[PDB]
Amino acid sequence: RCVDKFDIIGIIGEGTYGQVYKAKDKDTGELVALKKVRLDNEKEGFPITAIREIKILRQLIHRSVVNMKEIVTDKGAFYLVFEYMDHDLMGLLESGLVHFSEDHIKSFMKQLMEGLEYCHKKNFLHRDIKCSNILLNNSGQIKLADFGLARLYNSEESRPYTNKVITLWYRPPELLLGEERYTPAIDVWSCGCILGELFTKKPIFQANLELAQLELISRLCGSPCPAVWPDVIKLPYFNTMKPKKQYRRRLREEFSFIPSAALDLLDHMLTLDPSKRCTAEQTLQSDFLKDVE
Amino acid sequence: PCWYWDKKDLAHTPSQLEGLDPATEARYRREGARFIFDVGTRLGLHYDTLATGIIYFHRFYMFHSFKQFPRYVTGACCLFLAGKVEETPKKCKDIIKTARSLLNDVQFGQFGDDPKEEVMVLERILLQTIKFDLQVEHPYQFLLKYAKQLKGDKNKIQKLVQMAWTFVNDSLCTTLSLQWEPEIIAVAVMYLAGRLCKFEIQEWTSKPMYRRWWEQFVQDVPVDVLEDICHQILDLYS
Numbered sequence: 001r002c003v004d005k006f007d008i009i010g011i012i013g014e015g016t017y018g019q020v021y022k023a024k025d026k027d028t029g030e031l032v033a034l035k036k037v038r039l040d041n042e043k044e045g046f047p048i049t050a051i052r053e054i055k056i057l058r059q060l061i062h063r064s065v066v067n068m069k070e071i072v073t074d075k076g077a078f079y080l081v082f083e084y085m086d087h088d089l090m091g092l093l094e095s096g097l098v099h100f101s102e103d104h105i106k107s108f109m110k111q112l113m114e115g116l117e118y119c120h121k122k123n124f125l126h127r128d129i130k131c132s133n134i135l136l137n138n139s140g141q142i143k144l145a146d147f148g149l150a151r152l153y154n155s156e157e158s159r160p161y162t163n164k165v166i167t168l169w170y171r172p173p174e175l176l177l178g179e180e181r182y183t184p185a186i187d188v189w190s191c192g193c194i195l196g197e198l199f200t201k202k203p204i205f206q207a208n209l210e211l212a213q214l215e216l217i218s219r220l221c222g223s224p225c226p227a228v229w230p231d232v233i234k235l236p237y238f239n240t241m242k243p244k245k246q247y248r249r250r251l252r253e254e255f256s257f258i259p260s261a262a263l264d265l266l267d268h269m270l271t272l273d274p275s276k277r278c279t280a281e282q283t284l285q286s287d288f289l290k291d292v293e
Numbered sequence: 294p295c296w297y298w299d300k301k302d303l304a305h306t307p308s309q310l311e312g313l314d315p316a317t318e319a320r321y322r323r324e325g326a327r328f329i330f331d332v333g334t335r336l337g338l339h340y341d342t343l344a345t346g347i348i349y350f351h352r353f354y355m356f357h358s359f360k361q362f363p364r365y366v367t368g369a370c371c372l373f374l375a376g377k378v379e380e381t382p383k384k385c386k387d388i389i390k391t392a393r394s395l396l397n398d399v400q401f402g403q404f405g406d407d408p409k410e411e412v413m414v415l416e417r418i419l420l421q422t423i424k425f426d427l428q429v430e431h432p433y434q435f436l437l438k439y440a441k442q443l444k445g446d447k448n449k450i451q452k453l454v455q456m457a458w459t460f461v462n463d464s465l466c467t468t469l470s471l472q473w474e475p476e477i478i479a480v481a482v483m484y485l486a487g488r489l490c491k492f493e494i495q496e497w498t499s500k501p502m503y504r505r506w507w508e509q510f511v512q513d514v515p516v517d518v519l520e521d522i523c524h525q526i527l528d529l530y531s
């Protein structure tokens with residue numbers, strides 16, 4: 001099918017290989033988003049990263065995960081076609097003038113974590129969660145998006161993956177300290193950051209370098225040390241990258257304004273040792289999420 | 294999408310509407326597939342990438358004709374894309390060098406003034422033609438899973454697998470991947486191997502008293518389908 005089959009309305013994002021566009025399907029009337037994938041002025045053909053994103057998307061069939069309707073072409077680029085979503089999460093929060101109730105957040109996190117558990121059960125790591133890659137329409141419905149850094153991971157044994165992943169502010173400490181044999185716990189750390197940012201509106205760790213990011217995380221979650229995370233000494237940058245002082249965990253005193261069931265979840269999601277961090281399956285049995293319609 | 298045809302509808306290609314006789318089409322298919330196999334093998338690419346590329350090649354020519362798309366160019370394009378899909382990417386420059394090393398001046402003429410451009414251009418079309426259904430499984434993975442579950446003489450079982458493996462490589466020159474799912478091709482090459490080595494395969498299954506040993510691996514496969522697949526593969530050696 002061709003892109004003349006759609007009515008283009010305007011630009012609603014920058015994706016990694018082209019803009020995203022809002023549009024109307026001429027046969028059905030429905031509103032859709034079109035991720036452009038530019039080719040002309042490419043050196044190794046259709047971008048291998050796009051090929052990777054597309055294989056993954058085609059396997060993902062979940063209510064709380066973005067679902068690609070089709071791919072179309074010019075009269076020369078291609079466009080990935082998705083059902084349109086009114087906002088991303090970063091957009092609502094940044095205006096301010098938007099407060100999320102305890103129950104808005106409950107609903108929102110149940111959806112996200114069911115989204116993420118589906119992905120993890122099917123051996124995919126998202127590896128780029130953050131407020132701008134969570135979409136949200138006015139029905140109150142959530143979709144997890146941008147699988148442009150995702151990849152298959154191996155659960156029957158362990159393997160080495162790319163270390164520089166997840167944007168700084170949602171990046172967990174194992175990656176800051178240089179780990180390559182990491183786990184789905186990296187996605188849960190990022191979602192833990194969302195949960196905090198839902199209650200404050202400001203993203204909770206906002207440094208511009210890794211070293212400073214580590215400081216900010218330590219200062220709240222405790223300095224990483226072998227007493228709380230025995231394996232930590234086996235990481236490449238544990239000697240190289242230290243917080244100033246050896247800080248005590250004080251997450252609960254900082255976030256004691258939050259409801260208590262949420263605080264338990266948040267504490268668990270932002271646990272330094274990945275093997276002690278909760279899984280997406282586990283979050284869904286927490287008291288905060290256990291019973292949410 | 295559905296990527297499987299009856300034998301009746303396979304003979305009705307774009308190349309046949311356009312005047313090409315079946316013998317020549319069948320020859321152009323074998324030459325192309327072997328070309329993909331030879332180029333990939335020389336680049337060190339391994340069996341799933343080669344097979345993916347050959348599948349794209351076979352599918353592509355159910356929608357376009359050889360008179361319009363010269364086969365060695367299409368082959369190189371299918372392999373190039375397969376490498377990306379199977380996460381064993383190769384640079385287009387290296388696929389051309391290797392192609393050139395295997396072709397002669399006439400054959401390589403198909404690539405034209407800008408060999409690289411001719412391939413990149415074709416990739417847009419290839420992707421459209423295969424409807425971006427990029428994921429493909431092959432018989433090898435099922436040959437190994439099914440054979441691993443037999444229990445009995447290890448040497449005989451290994452010989453069986455090894456013969457069956459070669460028979461998979463051979464099947465790829467044919468349109469068998471457009472007729473039957475890889476699960477079925479696997480069972481068939483095992484069955485063929487079985488006949489030629491004169492191994493009773495049921496004796497290595499949990500149930501030595503059932504003829505249809507394959508039913509534990511795939512359900513619902515008539516013996517005449519396996520016979521049919523066997524006959525087609527054997528035709529290559531006649």
Ligand SMILES: CC(=O)N(c1ccc(-c2cnn(C)c2)cc1)[C@H]1CC[C@H](Nc2ncc3ccccc3n2)CC1
Pocket residue numbers: 011012013014020033035066082083084085086087088091092135145146
């Ligand atoms: C502020 C804000 O909330 N947004 C926004 C974000 C950037 C921009 C913008 C304008 N220029 N630039 C560079 C960014 C203008 C609005 C909305 C974000 C969700 C968009 N919808 C959507 N739906 C499904 C999709 C599936 C896959 C990929 C993308 C998809 N996007 C709608 C706009």
Ligand SMILES: [Mg+2]
Pocket residue numbers: 132133146
């Ligand atoms: Mg993004």
Ligand SMILES: [Mg+2]
Pocket residue numbers: 341429430
């Ligand atoms: Mg595979």
